[PDB]
Amino acid sequence: PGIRGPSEYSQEPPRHPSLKVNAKEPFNAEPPRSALVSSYVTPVDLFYKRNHGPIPIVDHLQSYSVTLTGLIQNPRKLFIKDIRSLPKYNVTATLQCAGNRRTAMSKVRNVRGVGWDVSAIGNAVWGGAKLADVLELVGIPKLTASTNLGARHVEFVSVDRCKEENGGPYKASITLSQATNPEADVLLAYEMNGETLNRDHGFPLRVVVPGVIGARSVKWLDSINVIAEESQGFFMQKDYKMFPPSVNWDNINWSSRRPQMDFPVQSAICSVEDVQMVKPGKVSIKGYAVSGGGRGIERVDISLDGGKNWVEASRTQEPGKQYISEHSSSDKWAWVLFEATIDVSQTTEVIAKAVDSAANVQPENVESVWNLRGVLNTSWHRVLLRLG
Amino acid sequence: PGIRGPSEYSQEPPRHPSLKVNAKEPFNAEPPRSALVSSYVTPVDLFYKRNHGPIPIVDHLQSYSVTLTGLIQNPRKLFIKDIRSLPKYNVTATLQCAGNRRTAMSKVRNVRGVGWDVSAIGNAVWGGAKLADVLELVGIPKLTASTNLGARHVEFVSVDRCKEENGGPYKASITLSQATNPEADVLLAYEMNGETLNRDHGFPLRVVVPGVIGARSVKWLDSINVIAEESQGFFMQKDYKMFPPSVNWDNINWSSRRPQMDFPVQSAICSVEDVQMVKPGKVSIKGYAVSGGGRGIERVDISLDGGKNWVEASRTQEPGKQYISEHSSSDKWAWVLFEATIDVSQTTEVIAKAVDSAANVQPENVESVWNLRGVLNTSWHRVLLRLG
Ligand code: MTQ
Ligand code: MTQ
Ligand SMILES: [Cs+]
Ligand SMILES: [Cs+]
Ligand SMILES: [Cs+]
Ligand SMILES: [Cs+]
Numbered sequence: 001p002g003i004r005g006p007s008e009y010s011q012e013p014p015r016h017p018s019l020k021v022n023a024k025e026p027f028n029a030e031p032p033r034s035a036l037v038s039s040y041v042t043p044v045d046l047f048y049k050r051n052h053g054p055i056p057i058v059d060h061l062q063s064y065s066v067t068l069t070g071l072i073q074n075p076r077k078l079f080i081k082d083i084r085s086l087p088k089y090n091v092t093a094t095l096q097c098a099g100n101r102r103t104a105m106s107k108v109r110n111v112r113g114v115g116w117d118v119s120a121i122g123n124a125v126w127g128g129a130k131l132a133d134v135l136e137l138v139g140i141p142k143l144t145a146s147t148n149l150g151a152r153h154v155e156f157v158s159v160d161r162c163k164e165e166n167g168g169p170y171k172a173s174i175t176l177s178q179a180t181n182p183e184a185d186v187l188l189a190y191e192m193n194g195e196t197l198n199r200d201h202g203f204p205l206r207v208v209v210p211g212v213i214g215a216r217s218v219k220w221l222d223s224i225n226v227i228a229e230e231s232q233g234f235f236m237q238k239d240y241k242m243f244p245p246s247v248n249w250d251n252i253n254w255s256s257r258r259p260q261m262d263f264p265v266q267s268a269i270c271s272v273e274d275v276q277m278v279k280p281g282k283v284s285i286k287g288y289a290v291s292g293g294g295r296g297i298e299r300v301d302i303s304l305d306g307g308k309n310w311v312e313a314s315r316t317q318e319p320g321k322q323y324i325s326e327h328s329s330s331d332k333w334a335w336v337l338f339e340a341t342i343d344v345s346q347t348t349e350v351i352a353k354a355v356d357s358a359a360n361v362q363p364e365n366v367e368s369v370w371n372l373r374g375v376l377n378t379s380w381h382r383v384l385l386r387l388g
Numbered sequence: 389p390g391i392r393g394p395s396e397y398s399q400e401p402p403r404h405p406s407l408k409v410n411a412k413e414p415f416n417a418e419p420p421r422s423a424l425v426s427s428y429v430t431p432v433d434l435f436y437k438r439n440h441g442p443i444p445i446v447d448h449l450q451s452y453s454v455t456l457t458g459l460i461q462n463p464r465k466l467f468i469k470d471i472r473s474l475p476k477y478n479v480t481a482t483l484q485c486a487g488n489r490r491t492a493m494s495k496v497r498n499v500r501g502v503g504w505d506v507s508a509i510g511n512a513v514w515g516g517a518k519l520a521d522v523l524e525l526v527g528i529p530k531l532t533a534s535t536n537l538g539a540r541h542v543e544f545v546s547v548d549r550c551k552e553e554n555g556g557p558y559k560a561s562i563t564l565s566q567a568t569n570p571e572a573d574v575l576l577a578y579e580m581n582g583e584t585l586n587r588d589h590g591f592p593l594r595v596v597v598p599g600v601i602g603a604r605s606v607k608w609l610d611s612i613n614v615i616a617e618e619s620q621g622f623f624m625q626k627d628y629k630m631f632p633p634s635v636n637w638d639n640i641n642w643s644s645r646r647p648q649m650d651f652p653v654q655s656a657i658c659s660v661e662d663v664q665m666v667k668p669g670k671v672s673i674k675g676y677a678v679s680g681g682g683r684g685i686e687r688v689d690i691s692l693d694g695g696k697n698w699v700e701a702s703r704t705q706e707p708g709k710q711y712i713s714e715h716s717s718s719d720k721w722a723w724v725l726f727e728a729t730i731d732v733s734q735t736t737e738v739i740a741k742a743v744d745s746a747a748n749v750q751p752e753n754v755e756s757v758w759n760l761r762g763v764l765n766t767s768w769h770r771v772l773l774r775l776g
Pocket of ligand 3: 065066067222223
């Protein structure tokens with residue numbers, strides 16, 4: 001034991017004051033819209049924070065370890081020294097919380113849960129060890145779907161403490177396939193944006209699962225548990241699922257839906273507020289677009305006339321570099337930043353929507369995708385510009 | 389030379405007479421709706437047929453070969469005997485033509501091209517050698533993105549002859565990443581539904597690229613050409629791209645869009661016609677749903693009231709087996725068949741839409757996704773039931 005998960009909030013780390021706080025305990029927060037999109041790589045200070053419990057505190061860093069157990073030949077135990085000695089990779093990858101844009105779905109028909117605007121999302125450079133390498137180390141070769149021992153899934157278990165698990169830890173799981181395929185870039189990350197991982201973001205070690213919803217990138221690892229069936233954790237089985245609009249608290253059956261992993265094409269306008277005063281002339285419409293599953297953004301469309309007509313915005317990743325969608329130069333796990341300059345002379349509704357590399361679209365209206373958990377609001381984002 | 393590509397249509401193979409023919413020369417055809425969905429595995433007789441030119445004819449089977457050239461150490465030449473001696477795989481995979489459902493898009497605003505109804509799609513068991521294995525044979529190891537010789541793409545060149553290429557061959561390409569990853573199941577297929585591959589479908593050898601539009605699964609292979617940049621073939625650069633609705637023949641710039649590979653969530657009702665007479669009582673609404681990229685179908689929704697309310701249809705792959713979406717038992721490259729029994733007492737509009745494992749949705753209206761080439765019509769399919 002080099003680390004503990006507190007059961008109360010007295011030793012929480014400090015955060016940037018500019019953060020819009022959606023829940024204090026546990027800590028759930030997001031940057032102001034106008035700062036989200038200022039840079040392609042999200043500074044740690046401004047990277048959104050989503051926690052189900054108190055933040056773990058490390059008393060003694062050497063003596064911290066991740067335990068490799070379950071359907072494995074030799075249940076080893078891996079120290080932070082051991083993880084840093086594996087071949088290091090740097091993966092650029094956006095974490096988007098499945099809760100992103102929930103508040104606007106709630107406004108239409110109420111949802112229980114923490115409120116989020118348009119910034120429950122962040123892009124960072126993750127440094128660490130590939131999970132496939134770590135599993136090779138324990139007798140599970142690369143590109144394996146299942147083993148002779150019955151292994152099919154990999155469960156990541158935290159050291160934190162959540163009310164929902166009655167004081168137990170946050171957990172998630174992924175398939176052995178995904179875990180064991182180095183091209184899927186699942187990372188045991190000990191670094192974020194070139195610095196040592198912070199407390200808020202999972203120090204000393206988190207999993208990062210690219211192209212998958214935020215909720216699966218488990219922070220503050222206690223164990224990596226190789227198992228026969230998917231994790232039966234509360235947050236795999238009784239959350240983070242996409243129900244149809246007909247489903248409510250009286251008819252919900254949690255086993256009727258599969259756990260959400262991949263996520264669909266998303267965009268939002270960030271350079272202006274949902275209802276914003278402007279001076280006549282040129283206004284810069286800037287924002288983000290992403291899709292899960294390693295799919296890029298082929299197109300961002302912007303409309304000034306209630307969606308009769310669209311004009312195409314520009315798209316960019318690393319600044320200077322030209323963005324190309326299904327391409328070896330592109331950062332396939334990361335968002336894409338969009339900009340369009342428009343001419344305003346009158347009170348104007350502006351709308352943004354994105355289309356990904358697989359030609360997937362965003363739903364026109366929240367109503368068609370409205371869901372009980374208030375997740376994956378990918379409605380066309382509509383903003384209103386007014387003449388002040 | 390054991391095979392040739394004709395320049396004229398005098399030696400075309402026979403087809404099933406039930407086929408609805410959309411163009412005779414070259415041969416472009418699709419089964420009647422009502423037969424499409426009778427079985428999970430589409431019989432070869434009824435599997436849709438899409439050709440840009442005359443069908444190649446083989447005069448001498450031994451002496452046919454595929455040539456491995458380009459950015460490769462030892463330009464080998466591989467005979468059909470050699471391909472069959474590699475480890476055989478059987479992959480279940482749906483080919484959907486990017487042109488599927490084009491005619492309905494054209495009704496709204498005219499598109500140039502061959503007309504298709506709802507059946508430019510088919511599901512089969514493909515037998516052959518993995519392309520990753522074949523490339524390993526020529527010194528390119530598995531899970532490579534690029535090589536020291538500058539290789540980044542793999543181009544498949546046919547032996548056929550197309551007007552568009554001025555008598556030259558149909559070609560496509562994929563990334564070295566996709567080609568070389570055995571989990572992507574790219575196959576050099578010599579078998580289809582347990583029999584030897586037909587002429588129509590590429591005898592003796594075609595590529596099948598799962599989870600990617602039909603157009604990339606190049607038939608009647610002449611050469612597998614490892615190269616530094618994407619193929620400059622006509623059908624990669626000047627076709628099979630997804631343009632926004634504002635693009636027309638006066639403003640089109642082909643380099644403005646990337647070549648379409650993955651495709652989005654699609655469904656159609658097949659057990660009844662777009663306008664159909666029924667007797668009061670119980671009517672079975674049966675169809676297909678698919679998505680590209682190895683994504684499953686999480687949900688199919690059916691509405692009888694103009695899309696105010698939806699009820700969930702059932703979903704099935706292999707009969708008897710229970711379909712589960714992101715699961716080891718599921719056929720991730722294959723379509724999903726849906727059925728719902730409904731009660732009709734009155735004249736009724738029925739609507740079907742699907743939602744994939746990544747929670748991607750279908751666009752409500754063609755207008756929003758209308759495009760010049762008339763590809764990837766994934767509009768909600770609406771049918772009209774009348775009281776006769
Ligand atoms: N140990 C641990 N405890 C958590 O509550 C926990 N929650 C997260 C969810 S649920 Mo969601 O609501 O799909 S977004 C999200 C991210 C947030 O990463 P970060 O704080 O570092 O921005 O951490 C995931 N990882 C976790 N790990
Ligand atoms: N050699 C060759 N010539 C073709 O014209 C050719 N066209 C195809 C397209 S273009 Mo599309 O417009 O996206 S659907 C489709 C499929 C059809 O395979 P099959 O006919 O056996 O169903 O083969 C692709 N492979 C090809 N291979
Ligand atoms: Cs431990
Ligand atoms: Cs890159
Ligand atoms: Cs050849
Ligand atoms: Cs399977």
